[PDB]
């Protein structure tokens, strides 16, 4: 519900003197937004749901190629009609066999033959459609207010601290004004519009791994199939039968099932998680405008923390050009601002590292409180520092 | 000489393709007020100011004053993605569409 730790994160500084920002959210991604003199926040799309699909086709990979039949007809006696031709109980196909006296027939030459094999389905590579008002979005907003390695990911704690929220967006009401206590409020106007990709693509289902395939590659493929009935057509894939046999037995070899035919065309179609009745669109996106002239700082009338500050471990690389770390405050005093900055060289006067966790501060007055901090240090070597003078501590860092 | 409909408007289903580069759809008016003009247009992107989709059913409007009346509408949207919209501001609803 917040950005820290995610690989699909994007940092933003709307505009210059902007109280709003235009943005784009998608499936498993998050966004951290910064704005002069205002808290940092994370807009993130949580879920995409239709709050009703329908099947269209069903290609099979098969079994039942067990029962056999071979209606024999002697030369000049015409064709052969197998009783197993009255019901789709079996699939029949005619042929002719060279014969005569040698095998019970009176004359010599080509005799009719019409055998049949049975057909039912096993593994149905089912597929369905996606009709374009039932689309609802779930956006979660976080506030980079005080936190600890611990509480940073706990949705509960955060809501409790009024530093988080999870609301939904609908074509009905595409906006919302999420209130965050003394932090004012943020009002998004996400516009349900999305690419996005037209319903034109079919919904391919294969065993467990669902995919999104092109109407045609799918529809225009070669495999047995069935719409919404127990009736199957084109079962001709019950092939490699015509050993061009004898009236006794026509080998009806079950055609080897090679999932390669499918698998091979994997990459083409995009993969998608699908539960019995749901298809989370990633695939999908959402253009929003994070208006936030109503987003406001807090604890700005407090004094600076003046007591020792200790690191609780080597800062970590977020993989985003920023690092995280957690402090501990020896301080006995209450809610004070945390004096942390990024300095290019020990005892420089002017900072150089911008803090993601802007305007940090010890939340409680209960000494030895923890403080989480994410900041982007300058490239190359630099120093993170907390406190000043002889209280001040530091830890070096080198970005690349 | 009537005023614009000012009450919620709900879609009654996914617009349909006429096969002519236009689509059809039917609205329902929560409105209790009488014969007012239906505020529907085709917008290229949410909250744009100028329309882009020409309405076949020009100058549409709720025929009766009997709330929850239905309105049929055929309009040609622009190629590619676009948005159909009815009403404005926080009353306004919308539904996306992509012509080819």
């Amino acid at each position, epitope marked *: 519900f917040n950005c820290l730790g995610m690989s699909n994160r994007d940092f933003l500084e709307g505009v210059s003197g902007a109280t709003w920002v235009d943005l784009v959210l998608e499936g498993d991604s998050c966004v951290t937004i910064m704005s002069k003199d205002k808290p940092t926040i994370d807009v993130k799309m*949580m*879920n995409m*749901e*239709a*709050a*009703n699909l329908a099947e269209v086709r069903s290609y099979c990979y098969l079994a039942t190629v067990s029962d056999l039949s071979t209606k024999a007809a002697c030369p000049t006696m015409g064709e052969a009609h197998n009783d197993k031709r009255a019901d789709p109980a079996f699939v029949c196909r005619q042929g002719v066999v060279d014969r005569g006296w040698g095998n019970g027939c009176g004359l010599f030459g080509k005799g009719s033959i019409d055998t049949c094999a049975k057909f039912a389905c096993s593994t149905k590579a089912i597929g369905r459609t996606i009709l374009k*008002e*039932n*689309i*609802k*979005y*779930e956006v979660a907003i976080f506030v980079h207010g005080p936190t600890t390695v611990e509480s940073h990911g706990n949705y509960s704690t955060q*809501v409790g601290a009024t530093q988080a*929220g*999870r*609301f*939904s*967006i*609908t*074509p*009905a*009401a595409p906006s*919302y004004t999420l209130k965050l206590g003394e932090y004012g409020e943020v009002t998004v106007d996400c516009e349900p519009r999305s690419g996005i990709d037209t319903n034109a693509y079919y919904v391919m289902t294969v065993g467990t791994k669902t995919f999104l395939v092109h109407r045609e590659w799918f529809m225009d493929l070669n495999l047995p199939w069935s719409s919404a009935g127990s009736t199957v057509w084109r079962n001709r894939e019950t092939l490699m039968e015509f050993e061009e046999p004898h009236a006794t037995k026509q080998s009806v070899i079950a055609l080897g099932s090679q999932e390669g035919a499918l698998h091979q065309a994997l990459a083409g179609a995009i993969p998608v998680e699908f539960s*019995s*009745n749901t298809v989370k669109l990633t695939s999908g996106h959402l253009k929003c405008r994070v208006k936030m002239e109503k987003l406001q700082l807090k604890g700005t009338t407090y004094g600076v923390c003046s007591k020792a500050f200790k690191f609780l471990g080597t800062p970590a690389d977020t993989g985003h050009g920023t690092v995280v770390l957690e402090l501990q405050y020896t301080g006995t005093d209450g809610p004070c601002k945390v004096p942390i900055s990024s300095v290019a060289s020990l005892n420089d006067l002017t900072p150089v590292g911008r803090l993601v966790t802007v305007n940090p501060f010890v939340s409680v007055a209960t000494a030895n409180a923890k403080v989480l901090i994410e900041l982007e240090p300058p490239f190359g070597d630099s120093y993170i520092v907390v406190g000043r003078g002889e209280q001040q501590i530091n830890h070096h860092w080198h970005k690349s | 000489t009537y005023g614009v409909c000012s009450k919620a408007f*709900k*879609f*009654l289903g996914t617009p349909a393709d006429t096969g002519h580069g236009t689509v059809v759809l039917e609205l*329902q008016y*929560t409105g209790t007020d009488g014969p007012c003009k239906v505020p529907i247009s085709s917008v290229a992107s949410l909250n744009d100011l100028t329309p882009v989709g020409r309405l076949v059913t020009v100058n549409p409007f709720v025929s009766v004053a009997t*709330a*929850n009346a*239905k309105v049929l509408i055929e309009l040609e949207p622009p190629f590619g993605d676009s948005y159909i919209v009815v009403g404005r501001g926080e009353q306004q609803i919308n539904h996306h569409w992509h012509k080819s």
Partner: antibody, heavy 123, light 111 residues
């Protein structure tokens, strides 16, 4: 799976009010409308109204307009129904039910039902 | 008094087919699709049919729905003892601007 857990049975005197809760889980709470439907003992189903947990907008049955209030708390995924000026005829099992998934109030219908809360109004 | 009209009671023997009617008007069934709910004794209703004739997953094919003009019908083939329940039809009503229900039918399964 969708789960809806309602508060326990209640008794009230005529003239009082009752507030019933429905705690939802197993789906994205703010993405589905919640309906309330009641059933007097031995009688049929009566729709009471619907609330959008996104934004909190409501539509109530005309016959209950003026003494029913539906609300929600999105942080606890709970929907509430309060009915005031109770009379004996309000004795019923009160069900909350998650909508099928409509994106519009029009054409919504209850699909996943809670276990019901019996409210008896008696002197 | 309910907006849609159903028989109060239907009965059948195990194995037979029974039907349950649901009559409405042009403002509900005439215009909009019909849903059916099954309510086993002592339990909440469950959705049985939606959109006139669609079954949710888990509902067997021997339950089938239909609609014709301003009326709808539920047919239950292969009647089983466990089918004994109250059945309710439902539809959106354009005139009332909300969902309406039938009065319910108690289905009893005889010996």
């Amino acid at each position: 799976q969708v789960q809806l857990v309602q508060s326990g049975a209640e008794v009230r005197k005529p003239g009082a009010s009752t507030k019933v809760s429905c705690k939802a889980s197993g789906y994205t709470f703010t993405h589905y409308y919640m309906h309330w439907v009641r059933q007097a003992p031995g009688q049929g189903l009566e729709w009471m109204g619907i609330i959008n947990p996104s934004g909190g907008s409501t539509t109530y049955a005309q016959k209950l307009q003026g003494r029913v209030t539906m609300t929600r708390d999105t942080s606890t995924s709970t929907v509430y129904m309060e009915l005031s000026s109770l009379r004996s005829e309000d004795t019923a099992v009160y069900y909350c039910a998650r909508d099928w998934g409509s994106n519009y109030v029009w054409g919504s219908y209850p699909k996943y039902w809670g276990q019901g809360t019996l409210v008896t109004v008696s002197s | 008094q309910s907006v849609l009209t159903q028989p109060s009671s239907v009965s059948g023997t195990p194995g037979q087919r029974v039907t349950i009617s649901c009559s409405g008007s042009s403002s509900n069934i005439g215009s909009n699709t019909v849903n059916w709910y099954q309510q086993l004794p002592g339990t909440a209703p469950k959705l049985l049919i939606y959109g006139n004739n669609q079954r949710p997953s888990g509902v067997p094919d021997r339950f089938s729905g239909s609609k014709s003009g301003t009326s709808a019908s539920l047919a239950i083939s292969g009647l089983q003892s466990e089918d004994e329940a109250d059945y309710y039809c439902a539809a959106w009503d354009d005139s009332l601007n909300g969902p309406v229900f039938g009065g319910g039918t108690k289905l009893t399964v005889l010996g």
